[PDB]
Design a protein around this ligand. Structure first.
Ligand SMILES: O[C@@H]1[C@H](O)[C@H](O)CO[C@H]1O
Ligand SMILES: O[C@@H]1[C@H](O)[C@H](O)CO[C@H]1O
Ligand SMILES: [Zn+2]
Ligand SMILES: [Zn+2]
Lengths: 212, 206
């Protein structure tokens, strides 16, 4: 697996020419640069394992719509696995304190773990965001921080189980706690546990503490 | 446009050709757990032309990360200070998200000149990132270099009042970490008039 950063002209087929020369892409992303020196150009990133990266390097350079090219470190190696926190501001921050603290110690030890958050409220809005976590790259655990959650949110929480995303809920009102993997009263501890569960370095696992 | 297909070699080579015939944003990765483990998750920002494929386990049009997660504030550095900035950023984003705006606060505790320098650099390839806040006690060397390059790509950088050369190359230096987080969010927010370009250089706090 190797990272490959690329900037090019926002043209049609540009991607197709690129996805052809690569004839193993484990990860791939592309978007239009919105600001800076290359606003309006396309940022193309591929993470390929196996093959002749060197050749494809040489082979793409030959394209007149190529601005920049360069290898990089996989997002897994720089930003790693992710803890997602959603809910009300204060509680989300409390959880973040614990998660960032725990991730700080773990990151020091080679593996990488980051804490991404977004304060959001409203049943449907929260439900929609919970659903979206399943489409997020490297997301592994979601912590729901709020005073009360249920309805659609509970449904999307049930559904997250089929994508393998773990869910930790605070001791809130509503039905969400029941469908979350575990309920934790203290928000800071909830944050530290989400990281501990993800971390290959910690022995803690959500599935090893059932039936307490 | 969402899709779940069999991770075959060069499957995007077919899809982008099918599309090149009839993409602002595009993302794809392998599901490494859950029901579709091993499969490949594909999302673009022809349903007929494509559905004519058997290796198409699914295909459901989604909102987009700019819709649900919006623009991002990235915070990097020492655990304690990153958290302090996050408290401010999360607080401000909470009020702003309450209306159309969608701003999320992404963070990662990291230390070491090169490790931090490398993370700063990677912010340029982060989708929807618009502001970076560096939180630490001392930062310089390669970090300062990557911060220079990072700003060339339109990303604004806020620095705490730390030691080292980093504060010298940042857009603004904020002494209070909580305030730094709120300002980072206010700058990104379309509902706030505050703009870091209107105060480039300036330092706020003891
Ligand atoms: O992509 C990230 C994740 O969705 C996080 O949970 C919130 O911020 C977004 O930018
Ligand atoms: O994508 C997110 C952002 O880069 C965040 O700043 C750190 O964690 C990563 O997973
Ligand atoms: Zn563990
Ligand atoms: Zn603004």
């Amino acid at each position: 697996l190797r990272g490959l950063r690329i900037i090019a002209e926002n043209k049609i087929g540009v991607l197709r020419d690129l996805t052809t020369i690569i004839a193993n892409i484990t990860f791939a992303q592309t978007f239009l640069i919105k600001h800076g020196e290359h606003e309006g150009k396309a940022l193309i990133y591929f993470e390929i394992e196996g093959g002749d990266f060197e050749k494809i390097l040489e082979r793409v350079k030959t394209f007149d719509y190529i601005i920049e090219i360069e290898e990089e470190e996989s997002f897994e190696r720089v930003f790693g696995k992710r803890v997602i926190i959603l809910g009300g501001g204060a509680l989300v921050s409390q959880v973040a304190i614990g998660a960032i603290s725990e991730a700080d110690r773990h990151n020091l030890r080679g593996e990488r773990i980051s804490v991404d958050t977004m304060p959001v409220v409203g049943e449907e809005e929260i439900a929609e965001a919970v659903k979206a976590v399943s489409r997020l790259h490297r997301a592994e655990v979601l912590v729901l921080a709020g005073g009360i959650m249920g309805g659609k949110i509970t449904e999307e929480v049930k559904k997250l189980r089929k994508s393998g995303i773990r869910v930790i809920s605070l001791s809130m009102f509503g039905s969400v706690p029941d469908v979350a993997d575990v309920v934790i009263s203290d928000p800071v501890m909830a944050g530290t546990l989400a990281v501990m569960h993800i971390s290959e370095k910690a022995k803690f696992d959500l599935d090893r503490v059932k039936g307490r």
